[PDB]
């Protein structure tokens, strides 16, 4: 299409928290029931540094942009917002027409997953405006890329109606790009009014793994802008090669996990293959 240009470009300073004990997902493609299993995969290490930013959806002609972040070996992405400000991400390397790029965006109708040689905008824009005669918001602006050629993948879910604009929502994702496969895991919980990331344990379920077959080293978050005459907050941590001890119940759910290399208590927990710390 045609990108909207902004002469005043700024971004909020980053902030740091801690991953606590989140980011655990189902790594293998084998159903496991009533067993303690140890696997070496890309996990988010317990209590690792986590950077978190804000998605300003309304603001003076100041354009606050989301930053382009590294992908490394994988990312843990989480957001705490009331109305769904976070819409998706773009993934790739150069993020220009010279290479392919993955685009996962969720407009009000449905979620769209495409892999093209996108020429992304400097400030990817998604707009809504308030229709006073219907007393409802309607999104009518989608300016993410100006060109999209030589596409190799397209996936569109069935259409729906997205609810447009203190129990916030917690949406967490684990993104893994291994051997040309982009594997996604997600979890949605109604979160309580916590400072940053909530304390607790919740295993992220397999959402989809896309045979895109492209190279991903950077990514950027896409949000919505409320055109008018707190904001959302997202959290990004990075996966590392770790050995984790995962416990499945009789129904197949991961009920608890142990970061074997976190501390001497966990190192002895994995040596003895038990989850009891008072022994």
């Amino acid at each position, epitope marked *: 299409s045609q990108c909207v240009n*902004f002469t005043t470009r700024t971004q909020l300073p980053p902030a740091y928290t801690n991953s606590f004990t989140r980011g655990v997902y189902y790594p293998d493609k084998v159903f496991r029931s009533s067993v303690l299993h140890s696997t070496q995969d890309l996990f988010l290490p317990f209590f690792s540094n986590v950077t978190w930013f804000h998605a300003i959806h309304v603001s003076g002609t100041k354009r606050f942009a989301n930053p382009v972040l590294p992908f490394n070996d994988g990312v843990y992405f989480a957001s705490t917002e009331k109305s769904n400000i976070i819409r998706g991400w773009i993934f790739g390397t150069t993020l220009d027409s010279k290479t392919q790029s993955l685009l996962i965006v969720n407009n009000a109708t449905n979620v769209v997953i495409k892999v093209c040689e996108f020429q992304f905008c400097n400030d990817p824009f998604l*707009g809504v405006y308030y229709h006073k005669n*219907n007393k409802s918001w309607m999104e*009518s602006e989608f300016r993410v890329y100006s060109s999209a050629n030589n596409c190799t993948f397209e996936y569109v879910s069935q259409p729906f109606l997205m609810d447009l604009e203190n129990f916030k929502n917690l949406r967490e994702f684990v993104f893994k790009n291994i051997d040309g496969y982009f594997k996604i895991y997600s979890k949605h919980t109604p979160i309580n009014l916590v400072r940053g990331l909530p304390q607790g344990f919740s295993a992220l379920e397999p959402l989809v793994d896309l045979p895109i077959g492209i190279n991903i080293t950077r990514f950027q978050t896409l949000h919505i802008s409320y*055109l008018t*005459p707190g904001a959302a907050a997202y959290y990004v941590g990075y996966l590392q090669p770790r050995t984790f001890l995962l416990k499945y119940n009789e129904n197949g759910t991961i009920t608890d996990a142990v970061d074997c290399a976190l501390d001497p208590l966990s190192e002895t927990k994995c040596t003895l293959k038990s989850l009891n710390d008072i022994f």
Partner: antibody, heavy 126, light 109 residues
Framework: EVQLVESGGGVVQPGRSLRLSCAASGFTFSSYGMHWVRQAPGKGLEWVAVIWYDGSNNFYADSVKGRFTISRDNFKNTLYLQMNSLRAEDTAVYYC???????????????????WGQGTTVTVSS | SYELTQPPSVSVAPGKTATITCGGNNIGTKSVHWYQQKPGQAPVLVIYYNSDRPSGIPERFSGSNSGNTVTLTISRVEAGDEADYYCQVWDSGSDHYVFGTGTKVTVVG
């Protein structure tokens, strides 16, 4: 004293160039997006091009893409329309209009073209 | 490449009400503005943002976007209301400002 004064119209053969001007006065010119709308003799209104308040963005009608170029000068409060490779079907009265910009956006959801000029005639004929 | 349909002719008596219909694909999700062009004059905005009136337009002009029907209503029509009325929206599906085919209002009687 808000005024938009178009000028620069005339008669040209098909294929030649022509430059229009819209001198604004009486308001903050850099706070409004500027339009060009043409109207063939005895026909309806046809939007030509728009340019946002600071010239950073502009949109064109498909019938003028690659042929017309819109620009503006915020220190002279002047809107321009450069017209190249003119065709017979471009003959019309050309109006310039202003549209308010909310906060760096001049889409037009909340505001319309609240002030028009008297127009300038452009005739392209063999 | 977005169509804004209007009836070509609307004739009303003095003191009655003229209803100018404007049609479009999913027009109930767009912001319609209305313009009045008297014979031999530049257009004048009379209704913007579906139902808002500019500073000087008289009270008897009003617009509607409820339902799937967009409408300009001219109440207690006077002789000076004879003009051409164009609806106009911003279409992002084609990045065009689109006008309507127009409606000529004649005060008969």
């Amino acid at each position: 004293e808000v005024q938009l004064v178009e000028s620069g119209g005339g008669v040209v053969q098909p294929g030649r160039s022509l430059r229009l001007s819209c001198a604004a006065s009486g308001f903050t010119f850099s706070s409004y997006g500027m339009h060009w709308v043409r109207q063939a003799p005895g026909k309806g209104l046809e939007w030509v091009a728009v340019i946002w308040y600071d010239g950073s963005n502009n949109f064109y009608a498909d019938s003028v893409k690659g042929r017309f170029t819109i620009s503006r000068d915020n220190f002279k409060n002047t809107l321009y329309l450069q017209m190249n490779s003119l065709r017979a079907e471009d003959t019309a009265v050309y109006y310039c209009a202003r549209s308010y910009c909310s906060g760096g956006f001049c889409f037009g959801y909340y505001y319309g073209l609240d002030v028009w000029g008297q127009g300038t005639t452009v005739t392209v004929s063999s | 490449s977005y169509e804004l349909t209007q009836p070509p002719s609307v004739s009303v008596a003095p003191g009655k009400t003229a209803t100018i219909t404007c049609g479009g694909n999913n027009i109930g999700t767009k912001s319609v503005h209305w313009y009045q062009q008297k014979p031999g004059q530049a257009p004048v905005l009379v209704i913007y943002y579906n139902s808002d009136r500019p500073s000087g337009i008289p009270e008897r002009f009003s617009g509607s976007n409820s339902g799937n029907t967009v409408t300009l209503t001219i109440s207690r029509v006077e002789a000076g209301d004879e003009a051409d009325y164009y609806c106009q929206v911003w279409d992002s599906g084609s990045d065009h400002y689109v006008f309507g085919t127009g409606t000529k209002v004649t005060v008969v009687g």
